[PDB]
Amino acid sequence: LEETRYVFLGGNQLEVRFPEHPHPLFVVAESGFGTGLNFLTLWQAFDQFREAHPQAQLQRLHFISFEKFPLTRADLALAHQHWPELAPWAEQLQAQWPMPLPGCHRLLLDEGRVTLDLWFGDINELTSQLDDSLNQKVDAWFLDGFAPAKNPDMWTQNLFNAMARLARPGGTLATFTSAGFVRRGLQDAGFTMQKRKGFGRKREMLCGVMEQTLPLPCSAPWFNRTGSSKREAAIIGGGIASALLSLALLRRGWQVTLYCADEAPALGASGNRQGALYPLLSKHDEALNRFFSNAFTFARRFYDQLPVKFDHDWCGVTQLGWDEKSQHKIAQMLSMDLPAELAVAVEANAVEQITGVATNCSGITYPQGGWLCPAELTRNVLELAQQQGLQIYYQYQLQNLSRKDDCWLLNFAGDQQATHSVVVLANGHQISRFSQTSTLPVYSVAGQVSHIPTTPELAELKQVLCYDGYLTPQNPANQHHCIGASYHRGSEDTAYSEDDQQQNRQRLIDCFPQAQWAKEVDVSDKEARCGVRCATRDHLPMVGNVPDYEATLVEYASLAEQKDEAVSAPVFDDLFMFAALGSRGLCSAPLCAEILAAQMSDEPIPMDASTLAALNPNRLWVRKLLKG
Ligand SMILES: Cc1cc2nc3c(=O)[nH]c(=O)nc-3n(C[C@H](O)[C@H](O)[C@H](O)COP(=O)(O)OP(=O)(O)OC[C@H]3O[C@@H](n4cnc5c(N)ncnc54)[C@H](O)[C@@H]3O)c2cc1C
């Protein structure tokens, strides 16, 4: 343990650099996370640092690391037992220890003080897939793992080059090994290397620093994500998206203001009483599946950590093949062989025990999922945000935006205007109401969810059912269930429809004609909540810089043939969008808020270049332009 401190903290001059670090955030990357020893050690060091030097500018730690073969958290725990001194940190690390899914996993520890990005996979396979936003963001490197002798496999020119790419100018690195090919390899990668006495009986150790500013690669500029240098932003919003975002920004030292068109928040699509938390898995869409898996697990972690009162139960969500198409989608999902803590098959006989209700058919189950009250969540997250200093103006409806020299002029309804440095459009299905956004491949889908009274037999239902519509367990606070899914493409109408009311029960009955419990559902009270989803085909949100449609057509007019020498993606200055959350919003919103707030602050974004491109707003125009 003292050798850990020596090698990795000492080798990077961290205890000295910290209090002199002229930035709010410090970024550290690690070739393997192993048992998490190095990270815990560093975390302790960081806490001691903050405790001893409150005046210091550096308030936040960011730690990126890789593990190819993660641990079961039981083994992680009893591994952590060897170092009792670190317990108070390790416990936290365990509390949030992520599920063994591929890709990037963000953990928010110590209420944001310490951010950990765990990438599960082969580090050499993953360096390729890392996002450009990560280039030169790394202040210090822990090059660690099994000794080069006895495991040369990890130590490759690939790795050295990658470390060189991510290390910011003046950034450092340290490793326990003095091995030659490592030194010369790191020198080829562009580091300036120095030997240093090893710890105790061991021999010389290596540490170096990047003493030059290398050229930044920018592989595919049409997809690239830029932030802002300005720290003051306005959000147009009042739904879950805006709330989560505002937390994420305030956390990062942003001065935030929210304008909402309605009297209160959560009167848009986020206004439901009960809504379902679960991932959309795809076997044949890589991005979609990656994103929903990681965003779903992050979502649960986040919701657990979030210090807010909101009705909810994670009771598990069960999805039944009631017919062919469904049985088949389910089948594919089960064919992709995923950890059972994510999704697992359920036979028709087990279905009654698990859901409390007999569907007379098999299905799949997401055990970590459930229902939550989105309206209460949004409302209360916003309240928390105001405490944190969020400035909210209700009844401000944004009519149009104009770009002045250093800012954005916002023109609202009712003769009101504001002026802000940065602007984010969070406003839901109305995202397209502005000239800058009018061409976006998003569309309105109105929908109606019915509020039904609970009954002794329905009270037996322990999980959210997903069939054609969906039926939630009752929320005991109101003694009702939500049952829903009315779907109208192209419709912005929020008016109650008796047709939809009736179709909500109908779908259920139709899916389980033999089931007595289902006949219990009673919509006769004409009670429902209606809202307008903003959707895309491909089913992913649009999060990032608002692209300039015309410029994007003019430039890129060729692309194709001309893919080199291309300009960065044409974009409006300091204008970002968080939108097209679909029907899956409670799942995607937290990690999106993270991705966007990270992007705007020029910090590390917790996701790979591909899935990120899959989330990008200029997506369709760009891929159509790539060919004809
Ligand atoms: C019928 C239905 C069922 C759903 N089921 C689920 C579910 O099962 N699981 C799940 O996770 N999600 C569900 N959702 C929600 C889905 O996730 C939505 O996409 C999500 O609620 C979007 O929230 P948002 O913050 O992006 O926009 P919204 O919640 O619609 O909020 C947009 C906000 O922007 C404001 N605004 C609009 N224009 C302006 C302007 N010009 N100036 C100022 N303010 C403006 C509005 O006041 C509004 O408050 C459901 C939604 C509906 C309608």
XYZ file of C-alpha atoms and ligand atoms in Angstrom:
681
model
C 0.000 0.000 0.000
C 2.817 2.459 0.816
C 4.392 1.320 -2.438
C 1.197 2.232 -4.254
C 1.422 5.773 -2.883
C 5.129 5.968 -3.674
C 4.923 4.714 -7.273
C 1.631 6.128 -8.541
C 1.012 9.193 -6.398
C 4.699 10.006 -5.971
C 5.597 9.209 -9.562
C 3.008 11.724 -10.712
C 3.848 14.376 -8.079
C 0.177 14.360 -7.103
C 0.454 15.396 -3.435
C 2.463 18.411 -4.630
C 0.570 19.173 -7.861
C -2.905 19.074 -6.275
C -2.842 22.267 -4.184
C -1.072 24.009 -7.073
C -3.491 22.675 -9.676
C -5.101 25.774 -11.169
C -8.345 24.027 -12.181
C -11.634 22.807 -10.605
C -11.097 19.303 -11.963
C -8.147 16.876 -12.055
C -8.149 13.917 -14.436
C -6.373 10.595 -13.927
C -6.386 7.535 -16.206
C -5.392 3.937 -15.463
C -4.418 1.025 -17.746
C -6.044 -1.470 -15.429
C -8.267 -1.087 -12.416
C -7.494 -4.509 -11.099
C -8.874 -4.744 -7.588
C -9.251 -0.968 -7.328
C -6.325 -0.496 -4.963
C -4.693 2.395 -6.811
C -8.007 4.203 -7.201
C -8.923 3.875 -3.518
C -5.456 5.047 -2.472
C -5.754 8.089 -4.731
C -9.278 8.779 -3.443
C -8.054 8.799 0.138
C -5.189 11.087 -0.869
C -7.696 13.407 -2.529
C -9.929 13.561 0.533
C -6.936 14.330 2.775
C -5.888 16.996 0.300
C -9.306 18.704 0.295
C -9.525 18.475 4.095
C -6.099 20.082 4.567
C -6.450 22.761 1.870
C -10.066 23.954 1.468
C -8.925 27.125 -0.304
C -7.424 25.022 -3.089
C -9.020 25.470 -6.519
C -9.202 21.780 -7.266
C -12.445 20.458 -5.840
C -13.160 17.509 -8.128
C -11.476 14.256 -9.132
C -12.068 12.289 -12.309
C -10.748 8.760 -12.705
C -10.889 6.725 -15.912
C -9.684 3.126 -15.919
C -10.034 -0.217 -17.656
C -10.849 -3.762 -16.516
C -11.115 -6.719 -18.901
C -12.227 -9.216 -16.284
C -14.152 -7.336 -13.564
C -14.982 -8.749 -10.146
C -18.206 -9.932 -8.538
C -18.167 -7.346 -5.744
C -18.154 -10.208 -3.277
C -14.628 -10.939 -4.367
C -14.174 -7.187 -4.626
C -15.316 -6.789 -1.024
C -13.212 -9.566 0.499
C -10.335 -8.288 -1.619
C -10.808 -4.832 -0.094
C -10.712 -6.528 3.312
C -6.917 -6.813 2.983
C -6.637 -3.027 3.316
C -8.851 -2.057 6.289
C -7.444 1.487 6.371
C -9.241 2.167 3.059
C -12.591 0.726 4.168
C -14.559 3.993 4.425
C -13.818 4.599 0.723
C -14.049 0.991 -0.457
C -17.545 0.641 0.994
C -18.685 3.493 -1.235
C -16.965 1.942 -4.247
C -18.787 -1.301 -3.488
C -22.150 0.317 -2.926
C -22.112 1.427 -6.582
C -19.979 -1.319 -8.152
C -21.397 -1.616 -11.688
C -22.861 -4.619 -13.452
C -20.453 -6.503 -15.779
C -21.679 -4.873 -19.017
C -19.322 -3.925 -21.892
C -18.277 -0.307 -22.302
C -18.128 2.766 -20.102
C -19.740 3.018 -16.678
C -19.884 6.264 -14.708
C -20.042 6.237 -10.917
C -20.712 9.469 -9.043
C -19.017 9.166 -5.669
C -19.008 11.530 -2.680
C -21.828 13.502 -4.313
C -19.773 14.339 -7.396
C -16.515 15.016 -5.581
C -15.042 11.883 -7.196
C -16.135 10.633 -10.625
C -15.113 7.153 -11.789
C -15.416 5.892 -15.371
C -14.985 2.123 -15.475
C -14.528 0.680 -18.950
C -15.022 -3.079 -19.049
C -13.113 -4.670 -21.912
C -9.677 -4.992 -23.496
C -7.922 -1.643 -23.109
C -6.146 -2.078 -26.459
C -9.450 -2.838 -28.162
C -11.086 0.159 -26.464
C -8.461 2.842 -27.208
C -9.744 2.914 -30.792
C -13.317 3.423 -29.641
C -12.593 6.284 -27.225
C -14.099 9.682 -28.006
C -11.979 12.597 -29.264
C -13.373 14.689 -26.411
C -10.993 12.659 -24.251
C -7.825 13.635 -26.145
C -5.399 15.637 -23.989
C -7.804 15.632 -21.035
C -5.618 13.368 -18.876
C -3.443 15.022 -16.217
C -1.725 11.927 -14.823
C -1.479 8.291 -15.893
C -1.313 5.169 -13.800
C 0.300 2.669 -16.103
C -0.272 -0.460 -14.098
C -1.048 -4.141 -14.464
C 0.882 -7.382 -14.474
C 4.657 -7.093 -14.797
C 5.824 -6.622 -18.413
C 7.885 -9.748 -17.865
C 5.266 -12.484 -17.350
C 2.602 -10.381 -19.068
C 3.877 -8.417 -22.080
C 0.343 -8.694 -23.540
C -1.024 -5.388 -22.158
C 2.086 -3.307 -22.791
C 2.005 -2.376 -26.458
C 2.883 0.558 -28.686
C -0.879 0.878 -29.078
C -1.275 1.591 -25.368
C 1.655 4.036 -25.283
C 0.324 5.961 -28.253
C -3.136 6.097 -26.665
C -1.744 7.377 -23.362
C 0.202 9.969 -25.361
C -2.985 11.046 -27.118
C -5.013 11.420 -23.907
C -2.296 13.027 -21.785
C -2.702 16.796 -21.869
C 0.429 18.845 -22.506
C 2.372 18.917 -19.254
C 0.510 15.809 -18.139
C 2.466 13.008 -16.491
C 2.579 9.268 -16.048
C 4.233 6.782 -13.721
C 4.694 3.016 -13.730
C 6.357 0.523 -11.406
C 8.403 -1.096 -14.182
C 11.842 -0.034 -15.436
C 11.606 -2.456 -18.361
C 13.329 -1.231 -21.500
C 10.763 -1.755 -24.254
C 8.299 0.119 -22.052
C 10.645 3.115 -21.743
C 11.604 3.276 -25.422
C 7.977 2.610 -26.359
C 6.695 5.492 -24.235
C 9.425 7.666 -25.735
C 8.251 6.803 -29.243
C 4.718 7.669 -28.137
C 6.160 11.097 -27.385
C 6.663 11.127 -23.624
C 9.826 12.397 -21.943
C 10.936 9.565 -19.668
C 13.009 9.315 -16.487
C 14.127 6.429 -14.284
C 13.617 6.665 -10.529
C 14.530 4.503 -7.548
C 12.007 1.733 -7.004
C 10.213 1.199 -3.707
C 12.225 -0.516 -0.991
C 13.956 -3.658 -2.202
C 12.648 -3.317 -5.752
C 14.570 -1.698 -8.586
C 14.238 1.419 -10.695
C 10.714 2.483 -11.678
C 9.652 4.586 -14.645
C 7.999 7.980 -14.791
C 7.654 10.550 -17.546
C 5.754 13.612 -18.699
C 4.437 14.901 -22.021
C 6.578 17.937 -22.718
C 5.098 18.831 -26.082
C 1.715 19.757 -27.537
C 0.851 17.060 -30.052
C -1.539 17.721 -32.940
C -5.114 16.646 -32.147
C -6.396 13.951 -34.590
C -10.121 14.770 -35.110
C -10.932 11.500 -36.939
C -14.529 12.226 -38.021
C -15.309 15.962 -37.677
C -18.923 15.671 -38.857
C -19.677 13.869 -35.572
C -17.430 15.868 -33.248
C -18.717 17.363 -29.997
C -17.586 20.801 -28.776
C -18.304 22.558 -25.478
C -18.154 26.154 -24.273
C -15.577 28.287 -22.449
C -18.406 30.236 -20.846
C -19.904 29.164 -17.520
C -23.359 30.821 -17.643
C -26.212 28.943 -19.355
C -29.953 29.145 -19.925
C -32.128 26.053 -20.347
C -35.526 26.005 -22.050
C -37.459 23.276 -20.326
C -39.325 22.147 -17.232
C -39.284 18.436 -17.963
C -37.106 15.625 -16.569
C -34.427 16.469 -19.137
C -34.030 20.075 -18.012
C -34.006 19.095 -14.314
C -31.341 16.399 -14.576
C -29.310 18.673 -16.802
C -29.460 21.544 -14.339
C -28.182 19.348 -11.525
C -25.345 18.192 -13.794
C -24.383 21.749 -14.670
C -24.575 23.270 -11.186
C -22.373 20.433 -10.023
C -19.784 21.692 -12.573
C -19.740 25.330 -11.472
C -22.256 26.569 -14.000
C -24.572 29.471 -13.332
C -27.907 28.109 -14.576
C -31.282 29.653 -15.466
C -34.408 27.724 -16.555
C -37.301 29.187 -18.584
C -40.529 27.177 -18.618
C -43.564 27.955 -20.757
C -46.148 26.525 -18.340
C -47.131 27.617 -14.818
C -45.378 24.603 -13.313
C -42.861 22.004 -14.420
C -43.677 18.443 -15.477
C -46.807 19.517 -17.375
C -45.332 18.111 -20.580
C -44.623 14.440 -21.309
C -42.844 14.141 -17.962
C -46.160 14.675 -16.179
C -47.260 11.036 -15.732
C -48.113 9.518 -12.317
C -46.285 6.258 -12.955
C -43.780 5.448 -15.650
C -41.582 2.493 -16.414
C -37.842 2.134 -15.936
C -36.224 -0.468 -18.200
C -33.728 -0.713 -21.103
C -34.506 -1.170 -24.786
C -32.238 -4.011 -25.855
C -31.375 -4.731 -29.454
C -29.395 -7.646 -30.844
C -28.969 -6.109 -34.290
C -28.526 -2.454 -33.333
C -25.175 -2.140 -31.558
C -25.381 1.522 -30.553
C -28.982 1.401 -29.395
C -28.341 -1.662 -27.235
C -25.039 -0.386 -25.806
C -26.562 2.940 -24.887
C -29.700 1.599 -23.274
C -27.794 -1.003 -21.268
C -25.262 1.409 -19.841
C -27.777 4.236 -19.469
C -30.244 1.934 -17.732
C -27.711 0.736 -15.147
C -26.399 4.268 -14.665
C -30.027 5.357 -14.382
C -30.671 3.040 -11.432
C -27.420 3.988 -9.690
C -28.190 7.685 -10.169
C -31.783 7.422 -8.950
C -30.598 5.607 -5.836
C -27.961 8.265 -5.057
C -30.261 11.205 -5.837
C -31.204 12.929 -2.514
C -34.793 13.609 -3.537
C -38.223 12.396 -2.432
C -40.034 10.676 -5.317
C -42.558 7.801 -5.205
C -41.103 4.688 -6.848
C -40.524 0.956 -6.578
C -37.929 -1.142 -8.367
C -40.100 -4.204 -8.496
C -38.720 -5.578 -11.709
C -40.299 -5.212 -15.132
C -41.668 -8.217 -16.987
C -42.202 -8.247 -20.750
C -44.388 -11.026 -22.166
C -44.364 -12.454 -25.641
C -48.130 -12.657 -26.018
C -47.838 -13.585 -29.666
C -45.301 -14.351 -32.403
C -43.555 -11.032 -33.063
C -43.101 -10.476 -29.323
C -41.974 -14.021 -28.511
C -39.392 -13.501 -31.249
C -38.032 -10.126 -30.096
C -37.788 -11.592 -26.606
C -36.084 -14.663 -28.080
C -33.381 -12.592 -29.807
C -32.757 -10.684 -26.604
C -32.277 -13.944 -24.702
C -30.069 -15.179 -27.531
C -27.566 -12.400 -26.849
C -26.526 -13.979 -23.525
C -26.541 -11.122 -21.001
C -25.944 -11.070 -17.239
C -29.086 -12.225 -15.430
C -29.057 -9.136 -13.213
C -29.918 -7.212 -16.376
C -32.392 -9.439 -18.190
C -33.425 -13.057 -17.720
C -36.010 -15.392 -19.254
C -39.151 -16.312 -17.306
C -41.291 -19.359 -18.022
C -45.098 -19.147 -18.087
C -45.317 -20.983 -14.739
C -42.776 -18.708 -13.005
C -44.559 -15.636 -14.332
C -47.325 -15.848 -11.738
C -44.934 -16.120 -8.805
C -42.776 -13.239 -10.044
C -45.404 -10.750 -11.254
C -48.153 -11.938 -8.910
C -50.340 -12.440 -11.946
C -50.778 -15.339 -14.395
C -50.195 -14.370 -18.036
C -50.321 -17.874 -19.471
C -47.147 -17.297 -21.521
C -43.408 -16.795 -21.153
C -41.330 -13.636 -21.219
C -38.214 -11.795 -20.144
C -37.500 -9.905 -16.918
C -35.453 -6.852 -16.043
C -34.994 -7.247 -12.267
C -33.334 -3.864 -11.628
C -36.156 -1.979 -13.366
C -39.515 -0.774 -12.056
C -41.799 2.258 -12.010
C -41.240 5.800 -10.732
C -43.349 8.968 -10.616
C -41.812 11.248 -13.236
C -43.843 14.341 -12.312
C -42.842 14.237 -8.640
C -39.237 13.449 -9.602
C -38.934 16.343 -12.036
C -40.643 18.726 -9.644
C -38.447 17.824 -6.710
C -35.197 17.599 -8.645
C -35.926 21.128 -9.775
C -36.514 22.252 -6.192
C -33.170 20.740 -5.207
C -31.624 22.580 -8.138
C -32.975 25.916 -6.967
C -31.414 25.225 -3.580
C -28.192 24.601 -5.507
C -28.829 27.990 -7.111
C -30.924 27.257 -10.213
C -32.884 30.366 -11.234
C -36.362 29.469 -12.567
C -38.822 31.595 -14.547
C -42.235 30.055 -15.153
C -44.644 31.379 -17.759
C -41.734 32.291 -20.006
C -42.447 30.814 -23.434
C -39.533 31.127 -25.815
C -40.703 32.389 -29.204
C -37.334 32.818 -30.909
C -33.549 33.053 -30.630
C -31.149 35.575 -32.137
C -27.329 35.552 -32.037
C -25.625 38.772 -30.956
C -21.876 39.358 -30.655
C -21.105 37.619 -27.369
C -24.467 36.065 -26.527
C -27.953 34.847 -27.359
C -30.954 37.156 -27.305
C -34.080 35.236 -26.323
C -37.477 36.598 -27.290
C -40.382 35.244 -25.271
C -44.136 35.642 -25.454
C -45.749 38.489 -23.546
C -43.035 41.045 -24.274
C -40.216 39.520 -22.243
C -36.610 38.933 -23.297
C -33.356 37.700 -21.856
C -29.682 37.501 -22.802
C -27.413 34.557 -22.067
C -23.987 33.262 -23.022
C -24.984 29.639 -23.541
C -28.408 28.199 -24.336
C -29.779 24.661 -24.138
C -33.052 23.558 -25.710
C -34.643 20.964 -23.401
C -38.222 21.793 -24.351
C -39.522 18.411 -25.530
C -41.764 17.961 -28.564
C -41.505 21.694 -29.277
C -37.757 21.425 -29.864
C -38.437 22.182 -33.564
C -40.329 25.479 -33.133
C -37.263 27.585 -33.885
C -35.575 28.356 -37.192
C -32.333 26.782 -35.866
C -34.125 23.532 -35.041
C -36.958 23.459 -37.615
C -35.340 20.847 -39.857
C -34.621 18.254 -37.162
C -35.601 14.620 -37.916
C -37.791 14.461 -34.813
C -41.533 14.157 -34.591
C -44.436 14.462 -32.176
C -46.230 11.392 -30.905
C -49.131 12.236 -28.632
C -50.234 9.673 -26.083
C -52.749 8.950 -23.350
C -52.129 7.022 -20.130
C -55.182 5.962 -18.109
C -55.519 6.110 -14.322
C -57.358 3.055 -12.999
C -58.584 2.233 -9.477
C -56.824 -0.636 -7.700
C -58.701 -3.803 -6.694
C -58.005 -6.734 -4.359
C -57.023 -8.870 -7.352
C -55.011 -6.203 -9.210
C -53.380 -5.324 -5.891
C -51.654 -8.669 -6.346
C -49.575 -7.384 -9.269
C -45.961 -7.013 -8.117
C -44.241 -5.773 -11.281
C -44.690 -3.546 -14.285
C -46.031 -5.599 -17.186
C -44.966 -4.775 -20.706
C -47.068 -6.323 -23.437
C -48.557 -4.082 -26.145
C -49.377 -1.334 -23.748
C -48.056 -1.530 -20.180
C -49.688 -1.869 -16.740
C -47.956 -0.761 -13.522
C -48.420 -2.023 -9.974
C -50.526 0.423 -7.984
C -48.803 3.395 -6.396
C -50.116 3.026 -2.812
C -50.031 6.774 -2.217
C -52.952 7.205 -4.670
C -54.344 3.645 -4.695
C -54.310 3.641 -8.513
C -52.428 2.001 -11.375
C -51.283 3.531 -14.628
C -52.127 1.630 -17.828
C -51.229 3.166 -21.133
C -49.409 3.462 -24.460
C -51.856 5.357 -26.681
C -49.614 6.310 -29.630
C -50.374 8.877 -32.365
C -47.614 9.776 -34.811
C -47.705 13.377 -35.976
C -50.284 14.419 -33.398
C -49.647 17.164 -30.829
C -53.136 16.876 -29.282
C -53.220 16.445 -25.499
C -57.023 16.411 -25.284
C -58.633 13.402 -23.599
C -59.944 10.760 -25.982
C -62.481 8.132 -25.008
C -61.126 6.022 -27.874
C -57.666 5.911 -26.282
C -59.098 5.432 -22.821
C -60.862 2.317 -24.101
C -57.941 1.110 -26.215
C -55.738 1.136 -23.094
C -57.811 -1.596 -21.457
C -58.489 -3.241 -24.787
C -54.840 -3.904 -25.607
C -54.349 -5.584 -22.240
C -57.431 -7.791 -22.604
C -56.414 -8.666 -26.189
C -52.985 -9.776 -25.031
C -54.282 -11.989 -22.218
C -57.864 -12.946 -23.209
C -58.015 -15.813 -20.717
C -56.790 -13.813 -17.724
C -59.332 -12.959 -15.019
C -57.165 -10.339 -13.307
C -57.106 -8.263 -16.498
C -60.884 -7.911 -16.685
C -60.549 -6.126 -13.329
C -59.062 -3.033 -14.996
C -61.683 -0.262 -15.015
C -61.267 2.935 -17.077
C -64.878 4.064 -16.601
C -63.801 7.092 -14.535
C -62.486 8.804 -17.659
C -59.300 9.641 -15.741
C -56.052 9.931 -17.723
C -52.980 12.083 -18.363
C -52.074 13.087 -21.929
C -48.795 14.309 -23.310
C -46.647 14.671 -26.390
C -43.536 12.582 -26.913
C -40.734 13.766 -29.180
C -39.398 10.776 -31.116
C -36.945 9.736 -33.807
C -36.770 6.624 -35.910
C -33.874 4.491 -34.590
C -35.171 5.395 -31.101
C -32.204 7.307 -29.655
C -32.232 10.874 -28.309
C -30.563 13.888 -29.911
C -28.053 15.424 -27.509
C -25.233 17.810 -28.297
C -24.517 20.861 -30.402
C -27.510 22.122 -32.376
C -26.325 21.632 -35.989
C -26.725 24.332 -38.637
C -28.749 22.682 -41.380
C -27.871 25.038 -44.233
C -24.151 25.145 -43.471
C -24.179 21.377 -43.098
C -25.646 21.125 -46.602
C -23.253 23.631 -48.177
C -20.123 22.221 -46.569
C -20.293 18.420 -46.751
C -22.164 18.951 -50.030
C -19.425 16.719 -51.380
C -18.060 14.745 -48.440
C -18.207 11.257 -49.909
C -15.273 11.673 -52.289
C -13.841 14.503 -50.149
C -13.881 12.937 -46.633
C -10.448 14.402 -45.814
C -9.726 18.083 -45.215
C -13.275 18.406 -43.821
C -14.480 21.224 -41.563
C -15.694 20.593 -38.020
C -19.427 19.923 -37.939
C -21.215 23.206 -38.705
C -22.917 24.248 -35.497
C -24.575 27.266 -33.859
C -22.345 29.060 -31.318
C -22.949 28.035 -27.706
C -26.283 26.327 -28.477
C -26.960 22.800 -27.210
C -29.975 20.498 -27.304
C -31.248 17.693 -25.112
C -34.220 16.048 -26.841
C -36.133 13.240 -28.557
C -36.340 11.240 -25.324
C -39.156 9.158 -26.819
C -41.153 6.928 -24.482
C -37.951 5.755 -22.827
C -36.964 9.041 -21.146
C -36.709 8.009 -17.461
C -34.054 5.540 -18.670
C -31.999 7.781 -20.992
C -32.272 11.145 -19.239
C -29.741 10.747 -16.426
C -26.878 9.536 -18.605
C -27.786 12.020 -21.310
C -27.652 14.849 -18.785
C -24.211 13.502 -17.879
C -23.053 13.269 -21.522
C -24.188 16.788 -22.364
C -23.027 18.505 -19.190
C -19.702 16.771 -19.608
C -19.545 17.831 -23.245
C -20.351 21.473 -22.501
C -17.750 21.657 -19.738
C -15.111 20.064 -21.969
C -14.843 17.180 -19.529
C -14.701 13.426 -20.231
C -17.916 12.054 -21.728
C -18.952 8.624 -20.383
C -19.493 6.828 -23.708
C -17.667 5.598 -26.823
C -17.275 7.505 -30.098
C -19.786 5.273 -31.884
C -22.772 5.353 -29.535
C -22.009 9.058 -29.248
C -22.278 9.530 -32.989
C -25.516 7.534 -32.710
C -26.771 10.197 -30.300
C -25.653 13.140 -32.438
C -28.283 15.592 -33.768
C -26.691 16.008 -37.227
C -26.792 12.241 -37.592
C -29.159 11.743 -40.556
C -28.017 14.626 -42.755
C -24.455 13.484 -42.152
C -24.952 9.821 -43.000
C -27.088 10.658 -46.036
C -24.374 13.076 -47.115
C -21.645 10.489 -46.607
C -23.233 8.848 -49.630
C -25.390 10.924 -52.020
C -48.082 8.787 -22.847
C -46.660 8.803 -22.365
C -46.099 7.673 -21.775
C -44.781 7.697 -21.327
N -44.224 6.579 -20.742
C -42.916 6.601 -20.298
C -42.365 5.466 -19.713
O -43.026 4.440 -19.579
N -41.062 5.481 -19.281
C -40.305 6.620 -19.426
O -39.146 6.602 -19.032
N -40.838 7.760 -20.005
C -42.146 7.753 -20.445
N -42.702 8.877 -21.030
C -41.926 10.153 -21.171
C -40.834 10.185 -22.208
O -39.654 9.749 -21.601
C -40.674 11.630 -22.655
O -39.892 11.702 -23.823
C -40.027 12.473 -21.570
O -40.986 12.709 -20.573
C -39.532 13.789 -22.169
O -39.330 14.795 -21.200
P -38.650 16.177 -21.663
O -38.044 16.870 -20.477
O -37.616 15.898 -22.727
O -39.838 17.080 -22.274
P -41.235 17.355 -21.532
O -41.460 16.450 -20.350
O -42.358 17.279 -22.539
O -41.064 18.856 -21.042
C -40.781 19.845 -21.995
C -40.874 21.171 -21.263
O -40.487 22.215 -22.121
C -41.343 23.320 -21.907
N -41.405 24.123 -23.139
C -41.786 23.715 -24.390
N -41.652 24.768 -25.224
C -41.188 25.830 -24.528
C -40.878 27.135 -24.887
N -41.150 27.590 -26.111
N -40.412 28.003 -23.923
C -40.257 27.586 -22.620
N -40.566 26.289 -22.277
C -41.022 25.432 -23.217
C -42.670 22.755 -21.471
O -43.237 23.621 -20.523
C -42.290 21.457 -20.801
O -42.299 21.634 -19.406
C -44.018 8.850 -21.465
C -44.583 9.979 -22.061
C -45.900 9.955 -22.509
C -46.513 11.168 -23.140
